[PDB]
Amino acid sequence: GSMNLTIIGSGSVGLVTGACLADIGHDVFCLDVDQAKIDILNNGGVPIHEPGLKEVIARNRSAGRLRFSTDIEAAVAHGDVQFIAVGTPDLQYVLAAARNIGRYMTGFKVIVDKSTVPVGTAERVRAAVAEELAKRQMFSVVSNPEFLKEGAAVDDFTRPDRIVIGCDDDVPGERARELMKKLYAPFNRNHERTLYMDVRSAEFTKYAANAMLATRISFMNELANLADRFGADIEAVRRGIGSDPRIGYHFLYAGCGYGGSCFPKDVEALIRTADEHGQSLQILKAVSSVNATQKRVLADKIVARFGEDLTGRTFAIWGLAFKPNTDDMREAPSRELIAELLSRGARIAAYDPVAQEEARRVIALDLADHPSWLERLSFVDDEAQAARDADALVIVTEWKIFKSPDFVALGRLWKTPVIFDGRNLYEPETMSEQGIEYHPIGRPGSRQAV
Amino acid sequence: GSMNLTIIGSGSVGLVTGACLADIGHDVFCLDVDQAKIDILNNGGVPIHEPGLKEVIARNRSAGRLRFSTDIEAAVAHGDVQFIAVGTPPDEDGSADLQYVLAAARNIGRYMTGFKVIVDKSTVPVGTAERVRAAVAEELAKRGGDQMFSVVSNPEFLKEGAAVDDFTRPDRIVIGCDDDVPGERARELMKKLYAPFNRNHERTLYMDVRSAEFTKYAANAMLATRISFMNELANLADRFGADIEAVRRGIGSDPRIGYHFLYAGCGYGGSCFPKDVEALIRTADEHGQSLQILKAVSSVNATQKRVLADKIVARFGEDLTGRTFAIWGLAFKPNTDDMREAPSRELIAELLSRGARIAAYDPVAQEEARRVIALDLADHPSWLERLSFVDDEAQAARDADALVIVTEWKIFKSPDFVALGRLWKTPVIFDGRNLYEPETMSEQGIEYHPIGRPGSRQAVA
Ligand SMILES: O=C(O)[C@H]1O[C@H](OP(=O)(O)OP(=O)(O)OC[C@H]2O[C@@H](n3ccc(=O)[nH]c3=O)[C@H](O)[C@@H]2O)[C@H](O)[C@@H](O)[C@@H]1O
Ligand SMILES: O=C(O)[C@H]1O[C@H](OP(=O)(O)OP(=O)(O)OC[C@H]2O[C@@H](n3ccc(=O)[nH]c3=O)[C@H](O)[C@@H]2O)[C@H](O)[C@@H](O)[C@@H]1O
């Protein structure tokens, strides 16, 4: 039941896919054009922030089931199944990957689009492979999207909610489908986790899922902003609607918006694809609009409280990464908040358990046209230090360390006991009793807040 | 354990609420202004299409735990807890109309002589309980009264046609109460009242009044959003040859999204989603906020209700004179006679406007569809002359150019295509609810036009 597999692209998705498939007994070749990334992996290091991944990689390297190389030809010759797992920030990489398989392949290949790619990409992949073959075998291209979450990727892969497989129903298609069935059998020994459909529907599914997740978030963010206008508590509302099983409890946390390298990119790509086919996605456009403005809500509340000129003010920032348990700064709400406060003259002292180095890098690039503003941005070693002389503390990313802080320690440090909370971590009444002026998103402030 | 309760407004919400609460041992007085409705209930009839309701009513009348009356003063004197369950239809500007709610409140204030818990069970905008309190307090001040009270929010989450089951086995019970002295007194009374429902699982969510009020709108708005979300994707699926039902399985299998309420089709209707979505939009706009997503959700639903006529016009032409269409399904959803905002009404108007003849079938809603469609098209008598209603699903297809499925009644899920093949002109089906597998339709020689999925080969050809 063991298969020879190649993963093309050893980024987050490709690396966990390859290592975990090796771990169930497949013989896996992980290919990447990035020689440093490959050297690092071959040296025993892991280029990414993923719990449990180092140990999976190590034991499968030792067992002879997992290799890392930049050797394109060797990669093609190895894998009967070729997973395309390159980035999609733009399809040249996906297509270049396809051409290489076509340029070197010798027997039947199943080519698996695992990267998130627009509907119709498998057809373009097929054409690229075909024409290479023309210059000189059969194959079929399958869609098998990834549903991993950054920082939880090993668990997400090893215990998936479902595995979606899009395949043609022609002869090479059914042969590919049988091979994918064999490949994923170890995940299907209890509940059937695999969902088979046609290629285009599988392609569409990945965008639709991320789009729905984003829609839930922006939906609650609009209601949170309304809650702040008419005296309601969005967390009460979240539990009140989540308890309808047709809605469910997850991804309904209002706050300072969504970021990351997935939702913004995928919802924008779907909006673009639709418009290119002559349809305006009204709901998704609203979703994207709402999120862009939601990343300004913390600054809106701060300006309402302190005025437009924040010169002479200092704000402590708790959280920089787009979500907890990652160092990923891509589309992080913290970047918008920091730019806005710096533009208004404030000093910023920022803390994040892991993302400080990457945050300093990308915020400096964000603000390259105003290099002097960076003179007012500092990053500290521990969360309490950020609060020194602060007019207010601003919570952006709900790392666990922020959930139960030492408010007495903070009270000896800050200038005024005011908190703006983009993630709704604390009970407003508790904040009231502690003499803290509390400004959450969509919930009534502490008594001091009004 | 038993408490004396009054329900003000004996429409479906009030009737089901009153009868089911009498059935757990409470002594319930159901008040309504409509003397005919009350006469009918006292003669053992039921004004609504709710399975099981007539039986619960009969049992509790016999037990002396359920009374029906138009006597307002008797109603107020009876109930220590007064549920306001009157209707909240759209006002002219689309906001919730609170005239009946406030009239009920004033009646309580004008007659009450001891502590009252006033329960807003009607769907009412955030802030309504405060207006109810102001109105009750005004009536008490006029009277020189010393009486205290508290207004609680306790929304209803019943589905029409399944109300008894939804009430007796709720997913949750939402109770919004103030935390002042009268408010805590009320909360404890509400806890007592619903105790039987929390015996084994805690089903009640307690929160503040405004959050309870908001919860009801938010829940219906989210359900509507899931539907319009999938309808937009269905229309896109057609453009790049994907299958919306495969996408539904593919995203519904993420438990963060869930499987329910992801059925694309010819749109949502009924007496709740359209009015509640519009009322929330209005409430927000009156507070200076534009709800961009909900406005989009409403806009796509409006256009979705035109999709079936669009497909039919694409297939047969702008002029449908001399064409006949069979309509399967009239009610806004299965298992009800409710015609409010039904997609069938828009479809039928568009087809008649273009000259078509229509033969319509619904297992239950024919009487009501007759009434409202005659109203819809009052300006166009000649259109109504081309509309008929049949008593048999197959008879609708007599001489029909196509069959159009609008409401997924179970009887439609297993058609007798032999019976149909004897009747229709051409085996063409436009399916607003995606009942059948396209491949299966291709095999039976049916030209099948679903929403957001590839059709049969005949449809493609
Ligand atoms: O396409 C992908 O690769 C992945 O994208 C997301 O994963 P990810 O972006 O890592 O993280 P999420 O946990 O979805 O968080 C996304 C953003 O939403 C925010 N969020 C999340 C949930 C919520 O209720 N509210 C909310 O604001 C988070 O703070 C974060 O900024 C999806 O959750 C994965 O299923 C998907 O595979
Ligand atoms: O406010 C209310 O009293 C009730 O409103 C709705 O109940 P209802 O209007 O009876 O009907 P639904 O079953 O929700 O159907 C609404 C519409 O959505 C359509 N729909 C539903 C589900 C779906 O996946 N797709 C879809 O188009 C249905 O055909 C129907 O036209 C809610 O479901 C109840 O929870 C709520 O208590």
PDB file of N, CA and C in Angstrom, chain A residues 324-401:
ATOM      1  N   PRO A 324      -2.901  34.398  16.794  1.00  0.00           N
ATOM      2  CA  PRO A 324      -1.943  33.807  17.731  1.00  0.00           C
ATOM      3  C   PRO A 324      -1.270  32.547  17.196  1.00  0.00           C
ATOM      4  N   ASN A 325      -0.159  32.189  17.830  1.00  0.00           N
ATOM      5  CA  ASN A 325       0.560  30.945  17.513  1.00  0.00           C
ATOM      6  C   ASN A 325       1.189  30.935  16.138  1.00  0.00           C
ATOM      7  N   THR A 326       1.552  32.115  15.653  1.00  0.00           N
ATOM      8  CA  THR A 326       2.294  32.198  14.408  1.00  0.00           C
ATOM      9  C   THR A 326       3.215  33.393  14.470  1.00  0.00           C
ATOM     10  N   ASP A 327       4.222  33.443  13.598  1.00  0.00           N
ATOM     11  CA  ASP A 327       4.997  34.674  13.444  1.00  0.00           C
ATOM     12  C   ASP A 327       4.629  35.429  12.161  1.00  0.00           C
ATOM     13  N   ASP A 328       3.554  34.982  11.527  1.00  0.00           N
ATOM     14  CA  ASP A 328       3.123  35.504  10.233  1.00  0.00           C
ATOM     15  C   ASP A 328       2.510  36.891  10.357  1.00  0.00           C
ATOM     16  N   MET A 329       3.073  37.858   9.622  1.00  0.00           N
ATOM     17  CA  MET A 329       2.612  39.241   9.687  1.00  0.00           C
ATOM     18  C   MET A 329       1.735  39.628   8.512  1.00  0.00           C
ATOM     19  N   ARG A 330       1.475  38.678   7.625  1.00  0.00           N
ATOM     20  CA  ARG A 330       0.788  39.010   6.376  1.00  0.00           C
ATOM     21  C   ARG A 330      -0.631  39.530   6.649  1.00  0.00           C
ATOM     22  N   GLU A 331      -0.936  40.688   6.063  1.00  0.00           N
ATOM     23  CA  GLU A 331      -2.227  41.383   6.226  1.00  0.00           C
ATOM     24  C   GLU A 331      -2.640  41.537   7.695  1.00  0.00           C
ATOM     25  N   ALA A 332      -1.672  41.640   8.610  1.00  0.00           N
ATOM     26  CA  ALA A 332      -2.017  41.717  10.048  1.00  0.00           C
ATOM     27  C   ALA A 332      -2.705  43.038  10.397  1.00  0.00           C
ATOM     28  N   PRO A 333      -3.851  42.976  11.118  1.00  0.00           N
ATOM     29  CA  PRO A 333      -4.485  44.209  11.573  1.00  0.00           C
ATOM     30  C   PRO A 333      -3.551  45.102  12.381  1.00  0.00           C
ATOM     31  N   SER A 334      -2.596  44.518  13.106  1.00  0.00           N
ATOM     32  CA  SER A 334      -1.639  45.363  13.809  1.00  0.00           C
ATOM     33  C   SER A 334      -0.930  46.373  12.924  1.00  0.00           C
ATOM     34  N   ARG A 335      -0.638  46.011  11.679  1.00  0.00           N
ATOM     35  CA  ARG A 335       0.118  46.921  10.793  1.00  0.00           C
ATOM     36  C   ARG A 335      -0.685  48.190  10.473  1.00  0.00           C
ATOM     37  N   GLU A 336      -1.994  48.024  10.279  1.00  0.00           N
ATOM     38  CA  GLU A 336      -2.814  49.187   9.976  1.00  0.00           C
ATOM     39  C   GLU A 336      -2.928  50.067  11.228  1.00  0.00           C
ATOM     40  N   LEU A 337      -3.137  49.436  12.378  1.00  0.00           N
ATOM     41  CA  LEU A 337      -3.294  50.185  13.621  1.00  0.00           C
ATOM     42  C   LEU A 337      -2.014  50.982  13.900  1.00  0.00           C
ATOM     43  N   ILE A 338      -0.873  50.319  13.768  1.00  0.00           N
ATOM     44  CA  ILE A 338       0.389  50.999  14.069  1.00  0.00           C
ATOM     45  C   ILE A 338       0.649  52.174  13.134  1.00  0.00           C
ATOM     46  N   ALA A 339       0.383  51.984  11.845  1.00  0.00           N
ATOM     47  CA  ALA A 339       0.571  53.062  10.881  1.00  0.00           C
ATOM     48  C   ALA A 339      -0.302  54.243  11.254  1.00  0.00           C
ATOM     49  N   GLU A 340      -1.567  53.982  11.560  1.00  0.00           N
ATOM     50  CA  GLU A 340      -2.459  55.074  11.895  1.00  0.00           C
ATOM     51  C   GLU A 340      -2.022  55.850  13.127  1.00  0.00           C
ATOM     52  N   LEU A 341      -1.633  55.149  14.190  1.00  0.00           N
ATOM     53  CA  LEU A 341      -1.237  55.852  15.411  1.00  0.00           C
ATOM     54  C   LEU A 341       0.072  56.611  15.199  1.00  0.00           C
ATOM     55  N   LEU A 342       1.026  55.993  14.509  1.00  0.00           N
ATOM     56  CA  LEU A 342       2.279  56.687  14.228  1.00  0.00           C
ATOM     57  C   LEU A 342       2.034  57.932  13.365  1.00  0.00           C
ATOM     58  N   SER A 343       1.096  57.839  12.417  1.00  0.00           N
ATOM     59  CA  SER A 343       0.853  58.983  11.523  1.00  0.00           C
ATOM     60  C   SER A 343       0.286  60.162  12.303  1.00  0.00           C
ATOM     61  N   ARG A 344      -0.312  59.865  13.439  1.00  0.00           N
ATOM     62  CA  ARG A 344      -0.941  60.897  14.240  1.00  0.00           C
ATOM     63  C   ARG A 344      -0.021  61.405  15.365  1.00  0.00           C
ATOM     64  N   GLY A 345       1.222  60.937  15.380  1.00  0.00           N
ATOM     65  CA  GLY A 345       2.233  61.500  16.284  1.00  0.00           C
ATOM     66  C   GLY A 345       2.546  60.685  17.532  1.00  0.00           C
ATOM     67  N   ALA A 346       1.861  59.564  17.695  1.00  0.00           N
ATOM     68  CA  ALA A 346       2.024  58.760  18.910  1.00  0.00           C
ATOM     69  C   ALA A 346       3.351  58.017  18.978  1.00  0.00           C
ATOM     70  N   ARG A 347       3.729  57.667  20.208  1.00  0.00           N
ATOM     71  CA  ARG A 347       4.772  56.652  20.453  1.00  0.00           C
ATOM     72  C   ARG A 347       4.126  55.289  20.685  1.00  0.00           C
ATOM     73  N   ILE A 348       4.767  54.248  20.166  1.00  0.00           N
ATOM     74  CA  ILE A 348       4.214  52.909  20.230  1.00  0.00           C
ATOM     75  C   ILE A 348       5.263  51.986  20.857  1.00  0.00           C
ATOM     76  N   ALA A 349       4.855  51.207  21.852  1.00  0.00           N
ATOM     77  CA  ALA A 349       5.718  50.164  22.381  1.00  0.00           C
ATOM     78  C   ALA A 349       5.008  48.850  22.151  1.00  0.00           C
ATOM     79  N   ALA A 350       5.600  47.969  21.347  1.00  0.00           N
ATOM     80  CA  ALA A 350       4.843  46.791  20.912  1.00  0.00           C
ATOM     81  C   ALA A 350       5.469  45.500  21.431  1.00  0.00           C
ATOM     82  N   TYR A 351       4.603  44.526  21.721  1.00  0.00           N
ATOM     83  CA  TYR A 351       5.019  43.219  22.177  1.00  0.00           C
ATOM     84  C   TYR A 351       4.266  42.103  21.463  1.00  0.00           C
ATOM     85  N   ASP A 352       4.991  41.073  21.055  1.00  0.00           N
ATOM     86  CA  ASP A 352       4.383  39.838  20.545  1.00  0.00           C
ATOM     87  C   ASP A 352       5.344  38.716  20.966  1.00  0.00           C
ATOM     88  N   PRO A 353       4.818  37.597  21.487  1.00  0.00           N
ATOM     89  CA  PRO A 353       5.652  36.461  21.933  1.00  0.00           C
ATOM     90  C   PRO A 353       6.646  35.957  20.886  1.00  0.00           C
ATOM     91  N   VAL A 354       6.308  36.046  19.600  1.00  0.00           N
ATOM     92  CA  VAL A 354       7.187  35.485  18.579  1.00  0.00           C
ATOM     93  C   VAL A 354       7.424  36.348  17.337  1.00  0.00           C
ATOM     94  N   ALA A 355       6.540  37.307  17.077  1.00  0.00           N
ATOM     95  CA  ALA A 355       6.573  37.983  15.787  1.00  0.00           C
ATOM     96  C   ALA A 355       7.306  39.329  15.747  1.00  0.00           C
ATOM     97  N   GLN A 356       8.029  39.684  16.806  1.00  0.00           N
ATOM     98  CA  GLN A 356       8.608  41.026  16.850  1.00  0.00           C
ATOM     99  C   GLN A 356       9.579  41.324  15.714  1.00  0.00           C
ATOM    100  N   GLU A 357      10.469  40.374  15.405  1.00  0.00           N
ATOM    101  CA  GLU A 357      11.483  40.587  14.369  1.00  0.00           C
ATOM    102  C   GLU A 357      10.843  40.778  13.008  1.00  0.00           C
ATOM    103  N   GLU A 358       9.891  39.916  12.686  1.00  0.00           N
ATOM    104  CA  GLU A 358       9.187  40.038  11.404  1.00  0.00           C
ATOM    105  C   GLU A 358       8.309  41.307  11.377  1.00  0.00           C
ATOM    106  N   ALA A 359       7.663  41.628  12.494  1.00  0.00           N
ATOM    107  CA  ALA A 359       6.906  42.880  12.557  1.00  0.00           C
ATOM    108  C   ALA A 359       7.751  44.130  12.311  1.00  0.00           C
ATOM    109  N   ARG A 360       8.935  44.204  12.917  1.00  0.00           N
ATOM    110  CA  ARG A 360       9.793  45.357  12.701  1.00  0.00           C
ATOM    111  C   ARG A 360      10.157  45.490  11.224  1.00  0.00           C
ATOM    112  N   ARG A 361      10.447  44.361  10.585  1.00  0.00           N
ATOM    113  CA  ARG A 361      10.811  44.348   9.167  1.00  0.00           C
ATOM    114  C   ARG A 361       9.679  44.853   8.293  1.00  0.00           C
ATOM    115  N   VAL A 362       8.499  44.246   8.418  1.00  0.00           N
ATOM    116  CA  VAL A 362       7.423  44.630   7.516  1.00  0.00           C
ATOM    117  C   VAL A 362       6.825  46.005   7.816  1.00  0.00           C
ATOM    118  N   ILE A 363       6.796  46.422   9.075  1.00  0.00           N
ATOM    119  CA  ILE A 363       6.269  47.763   9.338  1.00  0.00           C
ATOM    120  C   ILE A 363       7.215  48.832   8.774  1.00  0.00           C
ATOM    121  N   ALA A 364       8.523  48.580   8.831  1.00  0.00           N
ATOM    122  CA  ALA A 364       9.480  49.536   8.235  1.00  0.00           C
ATOM    123  C   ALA A 364       9.281  49.657   6.710  1.00  0.00           C
ATOM    124  N   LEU A 365       8.972  48.529   6.066  1.00  0.00           N
ATOM    125  CA  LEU A 365       8.649  48.545   4.650  1.00  0.00           C
ATOM    126  C   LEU A 365       7.327  49.260   4.401  1.00  0.00           C
ATOM    127  N   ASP A 366       6.337  49.006   5.260  1.00  0.00           N
ATOM    128  CA  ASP A 366       5.031  49.656   5.147  1.00  0.00           C
ATOM    129  C   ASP A 366       5.224  51.169   5.179  1.00  0.00           C
ATOM    130  N   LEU A 367       6.123  51.605   6.051  1.00  0.00           N
ATOM    131  CA  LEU A 367       6.284  53.034   6.319  1.00  0.00           C
ATOM    132  C   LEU A 367       7.540  53.624   5.653  1.00  0.00           C
ATOM    133  N   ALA A 368       7.960  53.020   4.543  1.00  0.00           N
ATOM    134  CA  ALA A 368       9.212  53.415   3.895  1.00  0.00           C
ATOM    135  C   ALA A 368       9.185  54.879   3.440  1.00  0.00           C
ATOM    136  N   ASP A 369       7.991  55.389   3.154  1.00  0.00           N
ATOM    137  CA  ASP A 369       7.822  56.796   2.769  1.00  0.00           C
ATOM    138  C   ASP A 369       7.852  57.770   3.959  1.00  0.00           C
ATOM    139  N   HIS A 370       7.797  57.238   5.178  1.00  0.00           N
ATOM    140  CA  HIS A 370       7.870  58.065   6.383  1.00  0.00           C
ATOM    141  C   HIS A 370       8.833  57.439   7.382  1.00  0.00           C
ATOM    142  N   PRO A 371      10.112  57.324   7.010  1.00  0.00           N
ATOM    143  CA  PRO A 371      11.078  56.604   7.849  1.00  0.00           C
ATOM    144  C   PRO A 371      11.200  57.188   9.251  1.00  0.00           C
ATOM    145  N   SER A 372      10.978  58.487   9.409  1.00  0.00           N
ATOM    146  CA  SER A 372      11.046  59.096  10.727  1.00  0.00           C
ATOM    147  C   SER A 372       9.974  58.586  11.698  1.00  0.00           C
ATOM    148  N   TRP A 373       8.811  58.172  11.190  1.00  0.00           N
ATOM    149  CA  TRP A 373       7.774  57.659  12.088  1.00  0.00           C
ATOM    150  C   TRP A 373       8.285  56.435  12.831  1.00  0.00           C
ATOM    151  N   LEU A 374       9.170  55.670  12.189  1.00  0.00           N
ATOM    152  CA  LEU A 374       9.719  54.474  12.822  1.00  0.00           C
ATOM    153  C   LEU A 374      10.545  54.788  14.076  1.00  0.00           C
ATOM    154  N   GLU A 375      11.071  56.004  14.158  1.00  0.00           N
ATOM    155  CA  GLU A 375      11.786  56.442  15.354  1.00  0.00           C
ATOM    156  C   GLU A 375      10.873  56.394  16.605  1.00  0.00           C
ATOM    157  N   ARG A 376       9.564  56.434  16.411  1.00  0.00           N
ATOM    158  CA  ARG A 376       8.663  56.397  17.564  1.00  0.00           C
ATOM    159  C   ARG A 376       8.094  55.005  17.844  1.00  0.00           C
ATOM    160  N   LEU A 377       8.616  54.011  17.142  1.00  0.00           N
ATOM    161  CA  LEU A 377       8.147  52.629  17.308  1.00  0.00           C
ATOM    162  C   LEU A 377       9.230  51.817  17.991  1.00  0.00           C
ATOM    163  N   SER A 378       8.890  51.226  19.122  1.00  0.00           N
ATOM    164  CA  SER A 378       9.822  50.337  19.815  1.00  0.00           C
ATOM    165  C   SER A 378       9.180  48.982  20.050  1.00  0.00           C
ATOM    166  N   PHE A 379      10.012  47.970  20.261  1.00  0.00           N
ATOM    167  CA  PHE A 379       9.517  46.625  20.537  1.00  0.00           C
ATOM    168  C   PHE A 379      10.175  46.198  21.820  1.00  0.00           C
ATOM    169  N   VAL A 380       9.388  45.623  22.729  1.00  0.00           N
ATOM    170  CA  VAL A 380       9.886  45.294  24.056  1.00  0.00           C
ATOM    171  C   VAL A 380       9.983  43.789  24.284  1.00  0.00           C
ATOM    172  N   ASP A 381      10.670  43.413  25.359  1.00  0.00           N
ATOM    173  CA  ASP A 381      10.940  42.012  25.685  1.00  0.00           C
ATOM    174  C   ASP A 381       9.801  41.312  26.411  1.00  0.00           C
ATOM    175  N   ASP A 382       9.006  42.057  27.161  1.00  0.00           N
ATOM    176  CA  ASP A 382       7.869  41.418  27.813  1.00  0.00           C
ATOM    177  C   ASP A 382       6.649  42.302  27.864  1.00  0.00           C
ATOM    178  N   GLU A 383       5.498  41.675  28.029  1.00  0.00           N
ATOM    179  CA  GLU A 383       4.248  42.378  27.808  1.00  0.00           C
ATOM    180  C   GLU A 383       4.087  43.568  28.753  1.00  0.00           C
ATOM    181  N   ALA A 384       4.461  43.403  30.019  1.00  0.00           N
ATOM    182  CA  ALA A 384       4.268  44.484  30.988  1.00  0.00           C
ATOM    183  C   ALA A 384       5.105  45.703  30.635  1.00  0.00           C
ATOM    184  N   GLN A 385       6.312  45.476  30.124  1.00  0.00           N
ATOM    185  CA  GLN A 385       7.176  46.604  29.737  1.00  0.00           C
ATOM    186  C   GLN A 385       6.549  47.528  28.686  1.00  0.00           C
ATOM    187  N   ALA A 386       5.687  46.973  27.843  1.00  0.00           N
ATOM    188  CA  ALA A 386       5.038  47.796  26.828  1.00  0.00           C
ATOM    189  C   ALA A 386       4.194  48.868  27.495  1.00  0.00           C
ATOM    190  N   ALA A 387       3.661  48.564  28.679  1.00  0.00           N
ATOM    191  CA  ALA A 387       2.710  49.471  29.324  1.00  0.00           C
ATOM    192  C   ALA A 387       3.353  50.651  30.048  1.00  0.00           C
ATOM    193  N   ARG A 388       4.679  50.648  30.169  1.00  0.00           N
ATOM    194  CA  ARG A 388       5.364  51.729  30.868  1.00  0.00           C
ATOM    195  C   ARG A 388       4.968  53.097  30.323  1.00  0.00           C
ATOM    196  N   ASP A 389       4.364  53.923  31.171  1.00  0.00           N
ATOM    197  CA  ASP A 389       4.005  55.292  30.819  1.00  0.00           C
ATOM    198  C   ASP A 389       2.955  55.347  29.701  1.00  0.00           C
ATOM    199  N   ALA A 390       2.262  54.238  29.463  1.00  0.00           N
ATOM    200  CA  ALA A 390       1.291  54.213  28.360  1.00  0.00           C
ATOM    201  C   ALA A 390       0.019  54.946  28.715  1.00  0.00           C
ATOM    202  N   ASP A 391      -0.511  55.708  27.754  1.00  0.00           N
ATOM    203  CA  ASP A 391      -1.847  56.282  27.899  1.00  0.00           C
ATOM    204  C   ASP A 391      -2.899  55.191  27.809  1.00  0.00           C
ATOM    205  N   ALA A 392      -2.615  54.163  27.013  1.00  0.00           N
ATOM    206  CA  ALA A 392      -3.540  53.062  26.874  1.00  0.00           C
ATOM    207  C   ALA A 392      -2.808  51.834  26.350  1.00  0.00           C
ATOM    208  N   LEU A 393      -3.379  50.676  26.642  1.00  0.00           N
ATOM    209  CA  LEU A 393      -2.920  49.412  26.102  1.00  0.00           C
ATOM    210  C   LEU A 393      -3.920  48.996  25.021  1.00  0.00           C
ATOM    211  N   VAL A 394      -3.415  48.438  23.922  1.00  0.00           N
ATOM    212  CA  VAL A 394      -4.273  48.043  22.793  1.00  0.00           C
ATOM    213  C   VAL A 394      -3.974  46.597  22.467  1.00  0.00           C
ATOM    214  N   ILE A 395      -5.011  45.774  22.541  1.00  0.00           N
ATOM    215  CA  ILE A 395      -4.864  44.326  22.337  1.00  0.00           C
ATOM    216  C   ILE A 395      -5.293  43.981  20.927  1.00  0.00           C
ATOM    217  N   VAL A 396      -4.391  43.352  20.176  1.00  0.00           N
ATOM    218  CA  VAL A 396      -4.647  43.123  18.751  1.00  0.00           C
ATOM    219  C   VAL A 396      -4.727  41.642  18.387  1.00  0.00           C
ATOM    220  N   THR A 397      -4.005  40.812  19.123  1.00  0.00           N
ATOM    221  CA  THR A 397      -3.919  39.401  18.779  1.00  0.00           C
ATOM    222  C   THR A 397      -3.983  38.619  20.086  1.00  0.00           C
ATOM    223  N   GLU A 398      -4.934  37.697  20.160  1.00  0.00           N
ATOM    224  CA  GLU A 398      -5.301  37.044  21.419  1.00  0.00           C
ATOM    225  C   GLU A 398      -4.396  35.889  21.851  1.00  0.00           C
ATOM    226  N   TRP A 399      -3.098  36.162  21.900  1.00  0.00           N
ATOM    227  CA  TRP A 399      -2.191  35.178  22.466  1.00  0.00           C
ATOM    228  C   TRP A 399      -2.639  34.830  23.890  1.00  0.00           C
ATOM    229  N   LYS A 400      -2.486  33.565  24.266  1.00  0.00           N
ATOM    230  CA  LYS A 400      -2.947  33.121  25.583  1.00  0.00           C
ATOM    231  C   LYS A 400      -2.347  33.922  26.729  1.00  0.00           C
ATOM    232  N   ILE A 401      -1.099  34.361  26.577  1.00  0.00           N
ATOM    233  CA  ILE A 401      -0.430  35.135  27.639  1.00  0.00           C
ATOM    234  C   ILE A 401      -1.188  36.422  28.000  1.00  0.00           C
TER     235      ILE A 401
END
